[PDB]
Symmetry: D2
Subunit: 433 residues, 4 copies
Amino acid sequence: CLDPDASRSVLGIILGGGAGTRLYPLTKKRAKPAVPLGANYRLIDIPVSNCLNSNISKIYVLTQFNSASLNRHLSRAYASNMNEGFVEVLAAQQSPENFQGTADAVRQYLWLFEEHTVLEYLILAGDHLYRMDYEKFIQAHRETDADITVAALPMDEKRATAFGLMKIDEEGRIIEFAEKPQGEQLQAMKVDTTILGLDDKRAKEMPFIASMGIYVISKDVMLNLLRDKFPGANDFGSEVIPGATSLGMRVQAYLYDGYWEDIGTIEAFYNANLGITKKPVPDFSFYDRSAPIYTQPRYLPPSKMLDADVTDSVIGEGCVIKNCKIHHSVVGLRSCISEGAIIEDSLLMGADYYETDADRKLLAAKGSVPIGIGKNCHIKRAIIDKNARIGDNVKIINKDNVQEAARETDGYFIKSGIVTVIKDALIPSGIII
Amino acid sequence: TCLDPDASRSVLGIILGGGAGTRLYPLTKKRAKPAVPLGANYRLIDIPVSNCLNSNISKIYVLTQFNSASLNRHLSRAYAGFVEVLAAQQSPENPDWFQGTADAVRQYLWLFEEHTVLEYLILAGDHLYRMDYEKFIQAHRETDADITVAALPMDEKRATAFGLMKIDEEGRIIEFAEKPQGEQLQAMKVDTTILGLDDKRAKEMPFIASMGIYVISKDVMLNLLRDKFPGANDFGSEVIPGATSLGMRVQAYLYDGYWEDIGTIEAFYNANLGITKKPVPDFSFYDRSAPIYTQPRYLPPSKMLDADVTDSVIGEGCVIKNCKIHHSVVGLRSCISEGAIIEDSLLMGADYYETDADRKLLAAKGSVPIGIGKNCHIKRAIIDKNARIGDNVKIINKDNVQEAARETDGYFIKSGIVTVIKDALIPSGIII
Amino acid sequence: CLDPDASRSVLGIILGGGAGTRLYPLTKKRAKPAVPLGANYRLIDIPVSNCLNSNISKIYVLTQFNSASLNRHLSRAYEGFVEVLAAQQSPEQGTADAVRQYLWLFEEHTVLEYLILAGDHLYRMDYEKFIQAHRETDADITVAALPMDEKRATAFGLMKIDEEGRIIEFAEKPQGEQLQAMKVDTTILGLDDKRAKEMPFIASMGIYVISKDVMLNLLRDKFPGANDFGSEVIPGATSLGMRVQAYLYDGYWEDIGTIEAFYNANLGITKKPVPDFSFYDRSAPIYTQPRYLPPSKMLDADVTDSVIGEGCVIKNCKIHHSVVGLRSCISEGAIIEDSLLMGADYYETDADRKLLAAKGSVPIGIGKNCHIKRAIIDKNARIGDNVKIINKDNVQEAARETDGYFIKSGIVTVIKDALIPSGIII
Amino acid sequence: TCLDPDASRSVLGIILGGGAGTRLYPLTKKRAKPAVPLGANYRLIDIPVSNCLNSNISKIYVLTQFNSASLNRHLSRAYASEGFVEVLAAQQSPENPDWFQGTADAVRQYLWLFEEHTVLEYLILAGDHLYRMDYEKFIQAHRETDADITVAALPMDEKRATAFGLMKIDEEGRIIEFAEKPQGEQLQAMKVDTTILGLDDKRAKEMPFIASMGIYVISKDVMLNLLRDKFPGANDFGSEVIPGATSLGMRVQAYLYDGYWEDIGTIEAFYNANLGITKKPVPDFSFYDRSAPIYTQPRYLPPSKMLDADVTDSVIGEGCVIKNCKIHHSVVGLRSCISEGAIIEDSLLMGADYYETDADRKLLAAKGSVPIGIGKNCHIKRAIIDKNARIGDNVKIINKDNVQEAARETDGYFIKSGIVTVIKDALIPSGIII
Ligand SMILES: Nc1ncnc2c1ncn2[C@@H]1O[C@H](COP(=O)(O)OP(=O)(O)O[C@H]2O[C@H](CO)[C@@H](O)[C@H](O)[C@H]2O)[C@@H](O)[C@H]1O
Ligand SMILES: Nc1ncnc2c1ncn2[C@@H]1O[C@H](COP(=O)(O)OP(=O)(O)O)[C@@H](O)[C@H]1O
Ligand SMILES: Nc1ncnc2c1ncn2[C@@H]1O[C@H](COP(=O)(O)OP(=O)(O)O)[C@@H](O)[C@H]1O
């Protein structure tokens, strides 16, 4: 428990719109927080939900640019029902026509954040797949009298490079910090993860304590660090966190034990998404009796299946599936899948609306193709973004096993060997990718 | 066009949710009729409450002879203007005593009287349909009617099952006939062109039926119930015709579109399976502008391990293993086990998920878990909420028994349809 | 520190309505929880607000009969929910009977305990500490206890605790060797010797925290015929050896069940320096319906010791030691002293106005050159010009319904919507 | 008759909340114009948003050159909890921008965002005018006449006319010419027959001119064409772009506006309009209305307390605490605290954002500081006291020398039109005579 309660003492600040290319092309026609997730959600639903389910109701979403789409989702899913909570988007730019780092994004709105009578700021990333009760995270921050509390966990040697690593004393206080080190520096960070609880067998298998990129910073400390101490810092992990320690500030670590995946990259995203189909039980479920992941109420009808053979898959709401075959895939909301289509190890983002039988009549008369997966199509190891018009006989098998290829003009982009059809893209029948 | 004052401030919707629920038994066993599960993700009550909401009518009262915890939670969480239950009896038990619709409305007239409105929109809570009540209420105001009756056109074969009306050339209602036949059916012939129906269909459907939908001016309601007919029990069959008899202004208003009375098991069974109809369903719950609402449950997308789904609809948060599902409707949270074969059935689903912990206790005693057991076979059946059906169960009804009651056993049979009572436990190997 | 959370594990059940014959005629044409209070509130706001500020978001309000007005108030003002539960199907009993009736509904909620709030009382309390004490003592029923001296003590249902605070005996208005036998050591419940000695008696308040299974078992199996909670079920569960603990309540607590006590409590917000009870509070404000009423206007008012509610229209007049309710219109020359003006449910336009005058009627509000002293003016009262309500004869009681008023404890109370013709004197 | 599609899904509201607020300083010192306090219990932004909401317009953007914490909190609590009400700032800092930005530039910069909405027309509203209006009929007219732009028109006499941009129409209500603040001959060449709009003949003769009001309806496409293609360089919306459109033969129609309307964008006008709700007969403008009231944040403040107050021609906000004083022809904002012997005349008291506790007052008294509110024996005359001001005892804000203009920020006040304005949070020590 906490006192004062988190509701009135903790402010949530989500770092969403990274303004990068890591998830390109999923971020080509939309704000990063809006990227579709798990058949029925969007990235931003993960941190907003965890907050709400943690009794945190004052939330700000820091993103690159305003998006009518994003606001509409946030407004309809959260704004409606928070005695004074809120979920507000704070855009960095006045347009999508332009860079900026996390510490820069926070300093920009320091004048607004400091107006809140709160004891701490909860800083979350907007692209991690995980369930966490932030009250225990904050509880640890208050009991250790920490200036900054960094969430951490065991990390293997392969990924250790992509993270900020640390070393803690028996109290969990952070004694040594290093942002994405490598070489001698990376090996020098290897530590005994037995103090974390790891038996011994899997402790030498993960001799690293990696930062999860989320933090609890006491109000005045934040203002102090960003305005006075490091007015020139751009990133938290790379500059603010290391700087705070070097100054001798109380930097505490908090050990997380649940599931946790950063899905900021295409491959990671892809694997995480198909990860909800694994049996007997997936490492992460959006639904939880106690702490479920929320999303926008859509009142879509129950999915229709004409003649479908579905194995190891999850099906979103309001799908219209004909005589087809779906395997080890995630079928997004409002997905239309035609006759003879074959979907394998894929992620179908679905669609934003339904075309009418009349809409589909005009398209044909013009040689265009309807939203959805066309007849006798083969979709394999792909990410089909929203409203994609995939013509008949299209096959996305990437025969040659090409790893990368930027083909925006042809409607796709290949990354890590994954073919991602862009949003609203049309892919003519007969095309083979 | 537009209503002025608007329906939001000048109209009061009053839904006749149901009596003892004698007609949809056992879907109503200890469950108020408005709470009965529908189309995988909804409840009956969602139909009239949605139509009101999409019609800019926000003040809604739901009258029901007995109350129900699920009805209150549903209305509470899904809506509430306001949406409130006005129960005749505050108990979840099925009343063994009779109360007619006129009685139901009479008892709470004093409450509806407290609302400053122009009309009361009276809706039956047993039909499947979509309707924008705005034009309906506008017509009522333009014709200066005291009562406006939604009229459904039909042919000679379907008409003997409704209360018909006879209109003059101005669409004014001048006579009623409750389920007429022979010479009285004929004397009810009407020229349907007068209400807007075209020639071919007018001659094909020369009878107009009331469909439990009415608009009644405030004062008229009070007068009819307290003064004119204080002993009337039935609103539609006694009070409306009574009003016409008094020379009151009762107008017809043509209703055009899909409409099904689903207050009886068989009709309920059919309509529910009608959403799987090919090429397209007669009634869709979803609609771009006027969708049917319900409670946001934040249920996860349905999981299917190895399912063969033919002409069916899958609700939300389902957990389907390897099985065959043909021409069926699968309600929310459903759990189908390995080897199950489901055909021509309506699965209500469940109200919650049994944790692995609960499944342990269950395993400890060898008890049956909620869901469809392994290798079961469900045919032409309705499976109410949280049913605990065991392995190798076979519900196929071989002797084609038509009517039958076996509450004790946990089921009923009406028109060949087997209905597994809610929370019912059907032991392993049982063959029905 | 509650775990699980109160909002998730506690169901609030407020017991109002119930006959309502002491506050007549304020309860004549309305539901009891809806009776106006302190210029801008209603009775029901006190318990609902204390619940909400105590993290208790699931609330049922039990009343005698439905009321669109009360619902409107609760709807517009307040996962969570605040639902009214009517006992009867028309406006034409025991506390446990009231609760029992909806057992079928209460039972369906997955809560550890039910918070029972009964009676009409002014007071701010944090039910979280009360629910904590109940949990820490692994009690079946925790009964809020009010400390008291021997003078008052002999007038209430006293309780006797033990070294552990566990209540072991009850007694309705005891005296002699029996009153002295109830006398306990309040220091045990948390009071300091000083106060504990001044008040060696503890009384029930009508506030209880009952565990879910317990109240279901107590009301359904154990005492299915019990009518009242405190007089039967609570004592009865103790004699059956159930852990019935007591929680010391040490704060403002004023009864407002009678016209005289209701009157004094409302005028009490004008108490010097700091009134005993303030409706506002930085942490636990008393909530109410947002009406978007305009700032109050005063053309020429001499106001002393009084509070003025929202959107009032006041011409030239004197207001003294009074509480002026929302939307209250006061005409020229009016003199108002020691009265509670409850205001109006709406405003009249000059259209409806210059249509009443020309119809021999009276517009809502206090008329020209009126005088109102020691009176309670219910909602929408139409008081004509020159009316004088002084009760010069100091009459104590008078049922003058037909004339739009009633006199109680020397206090004149003008019925809601009543029309007092101009010139009338009282 | 009503709009189809309804305003909610087809109309987008865009409020020009203000620029750097130089004309309303110091009420705009570190406070975007939209957040400026009004009528004891409201803020400027409440007028247009309420007019929108009461017109079935629920998608709303508020443009303001700079941002402010209070503006964000107010909209969040009063409206956030259907469409939205979002602030689109030009600079994400609460500091008053020292650079210029025109209204046309304001909108042009976010046209990409507006364009993302599926609406038919854009309703453009000034954010510093006091008036009540149902935008539905107005929008209805825009659609029936197939107009490209509809401008609400305000009839006025020769005297008042010179301060506004006047318009000339034909005999069918179409606008054919504009004159920005005309005089002499230019003014005379603008006279029109207001009857053409529906005005009364008698009134039409006393008011032969019609001014633009800063209220327009523009078809989505027309908007993009004008600011992107036709006039990519225009800075001012109502003075360059609209006349431009008319110049291009676009269908620019006038829509008569009857009723109360005051521009409260300068100190003097703002001041007069606020004190205008204290008229004995009938206030020309009422924040409250049976059908379309001005909304604001529900604050759950307690009834105002008055110890010994002689109040004449004044309005009193919510949660006030008043002792033995005299309040004449004034507006007293929420949470106001007025001490013993204070005389408040012809003044607008904005109130405070919170209450101080006795604990707080002892600490202030102990350190020789001043508590929020007006002090004992204070004389406040013809003044605007902004939020949380700390006026010490015996302070006299009377302006003995009748100074008309004076800037004295370091002293905590500005004088404009003989109106003293005490700056927000300003501390005016006891005995001080202004
Ligand atoms: N200008 C901007 N405005 C708003 N949002 C922006 C932004 N720039 C980036 N973001 C978002 O905020 C998060 C911040 O992460 P960083 O960009 O600083 O780097 P990194 O992803 O390497 O991770 C970090 O996360 C890992 C764990 O994933 C730690 O180990 C490491 O110490 C830490 O730097 C990203 O997930 C991104 O989506
Ligand atoms: N006591 C009752 N309270 C509320 N609704 C009822 C009651 N009895 C029946 N109903 C509902 O009202 C409808 C029956 O309408 P009614 O006008 O009484 O028919 P009839 O034509 O037989 O008079 C059905 O939708 C039914 O579920
Ligand atoms: N940069 C700006 N952004 C938003 N609104 C502005 C800006 N500058 C001024 N405004 C507001 O818009 C309206 C019009 O400004 P004004 O300077 O008279 O130009 P015009 O009327 O020619 O458009 C006023 O209500 C003003 O406060």
